[PDB]
Amino acid sequence: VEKRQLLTDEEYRELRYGKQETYPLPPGVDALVKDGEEVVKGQELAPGVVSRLDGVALYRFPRRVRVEYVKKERAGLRLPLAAWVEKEAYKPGEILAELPEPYLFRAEEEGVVELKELEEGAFLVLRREDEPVATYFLPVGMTPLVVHGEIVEKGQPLAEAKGLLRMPRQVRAAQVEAEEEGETVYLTLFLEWTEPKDYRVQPHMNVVVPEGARVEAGDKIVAAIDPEEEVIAEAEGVVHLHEPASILVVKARVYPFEDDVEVSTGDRVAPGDVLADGGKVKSDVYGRVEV
């Protein structure tokens, strides 16, 4: 565009403020793409919603915040020796034993059952008075034969194994200790996995954590007007955003940082100028800064 040229208002907003277009989604319907996501024209962003330009989509208002909280603990399982595969760990989905015929996994203490079911798989915890006695781990293929809140003595069947049994996919086998005795081995696996707890964000509140951020106990996820109805992070986990109000498909260029930023929000800038971090990160394009 040359000196002494007549631009309409929109034209001037493009050249001076840049293209961007926000799209609403049917309330509840989730995001076929997700936050931070670079995308381009005609690309499906939700069942009925598709973008008509290029750029870096951004989430507006997540109504559903899910925290995958992290667990690392110790659980055991006894199996026939001629039916388990030897490995010192079990990547998720990884087959760890196969049983010729069904074999019943029996108790090795007495107490009340604390059943803890997972997407695929299950935990079983026994306890005489409210101290724990044992933590058994049912993999995939072992079908529990108890209910939560239930009494078992030594040696009655808890689960039944049938055929192949494999690790679940959310769950890891960090280290695996085995010990033979009789015609069985009893693994104490150092399992690792995470659990979903879905939080609801309300119109007068604002999630204050990015996508995939790490938090400890205490850390604040959502804020609100009154200190109640805030969501604090129960303990260690990391965050996820589903169900935004709608998503803004900007045409910009993102540049993460690690330390103090040298440019504030509002600044005009060209390529090559020093954005943040002592001069490492720098501008690709001509454009308009948004810290």
């Binding site: 007007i225 109000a245 330390d259 930023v261 040298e262």
Partner: protein, 346 residues
């Protein structure tokens, strides 16, 4: 072409907020002010002087003008200068320069977003001395007030709180610039009182009321006299170019004499006096026709009582008051021959 459909169109571009974007922008504006005096007591400069600098850099150098009230002239050198001992702070202190900047940016989108609301209020204050747009702009003017005073935490929509400052600001303009003769906003307020109460009186009586029928229903401290002189200051002037006749070859102003400047009769009548009285000082004595020519003025007047009379006349204080009598005396006999003075008393 039509300067209202024009503005009705620019407005129709900024989308209306939704409940989250409402509370988002409002929230950011609140926090940004907090940020600004946290940002003030760290560096110790001044909240406002600091606020204008946030303001400049967000809107662009497009606008900057030495803001009345700030102590230094806010020229683009002091905005780089001061934006410097700003970005000079630790990431946990210069944390708030990003907060302010975000605030000012949300200030705007929240004003710009809610202009269609002002329109829908000024629309019904028409025909009151101010034009639609004039009313809109005033309306807007108040809207700005509404954001710097909003409290998103009270949970009310924005519409609700602003519909107060908006009409508060129309109504102050309708009442401060409408009349060619500006009358304090409170006198304007009581005037409208007479109007509205007179109207009901008429709707009650079947005829317009008298002065006293107003002073009664207007209550105590109100007499007929005081309703009357209130109405005559209520009185709006009229155009010198008002049309006289159904043609247009005479102006109401053309039938209005110019009382101020002297007429040629008067102009001449003055010059013949102020010398045929100089034609009665140099007739008997010109130093007694000079000390009483300085007991008043040939031009400017010189007359007090006893004080400069006592300074430089040559003579003592109550001796000039005696040749004051004889200077006058001589003129009262002097002016029984040159009797050409009586006419000048009209």
């Amino acid at each position: 072409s039509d300067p209202v459909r024009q503005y009705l169109h620019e407005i129709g571009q900024v989308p209306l907020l939704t409940l989250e974007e409402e509370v988002e922008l409002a929230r950011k504006v609140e926090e940004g002010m907090e940020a600004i005096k946290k940002l003030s007591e760290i560096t110790g400069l001044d909240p406002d002087l600091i606020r204008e600098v946030v303001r400049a850099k967000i809107l662009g150098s497009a606008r900057v003008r030495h803001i009345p009230g700030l102590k230094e002239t806010l020229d683009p050198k002091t905005v780089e200068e001061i934006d410097q001992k700003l970005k000079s702070l630790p990431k946990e202190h210069k944390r708030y320069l990003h907060i302010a900047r975000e605030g000012e940016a949300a200030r705007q989108h929240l004003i710009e977003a809610n202009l269609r609301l002002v329109v829908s209020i000024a629309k019904k204050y028409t025909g009151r001395g101010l034009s639609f747009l004039d009313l809109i702009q005033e309306g807007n003017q108040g809207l700005i007030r509404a954001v710097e005073k909003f409290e998103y935490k009270r949970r009310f929509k924005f519409s609700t709180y602003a519909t107060w400052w908006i009409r508060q600001a129309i109504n102050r303009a309708i009442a401060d610039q409408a009349r060619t003769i500006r009358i304090p906003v409170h006198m304007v307020e009581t005037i409208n009182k007479l109007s509205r109460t007179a109207r009901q009186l008429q709707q009650e009586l079947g005829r317009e009321p008298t002065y006293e029928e107003i002073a009664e229903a207007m209550g105590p401290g109100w007499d007929a006299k005081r309703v009357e002189e209130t109405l005559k200051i209520a009185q709006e002037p009229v155009s010198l170019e008002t049309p006289i006749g159904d043609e247009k070859d005479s102006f109401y102003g053309d039938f209005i004499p110019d009382e101020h400047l002297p007429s040629p009769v008067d102009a001449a009548t003055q010059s013949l006096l102020s010398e045929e009285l100089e034609k009665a000082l140099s007739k008997l004595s010109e130093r007694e026709a000079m000390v009483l020519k300085l007991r008043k003025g040939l031009i400017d007047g010189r007359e007090h009582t006893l004080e400069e009379v006592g300074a430089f006349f040559g003579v003592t204080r109550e001796r000039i008051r005696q040749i004051e009598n004889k200077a006058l005396r001589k003129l009262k006999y002097h002016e029984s021959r040159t009797r050409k003075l009586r006419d000048f008393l009209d």
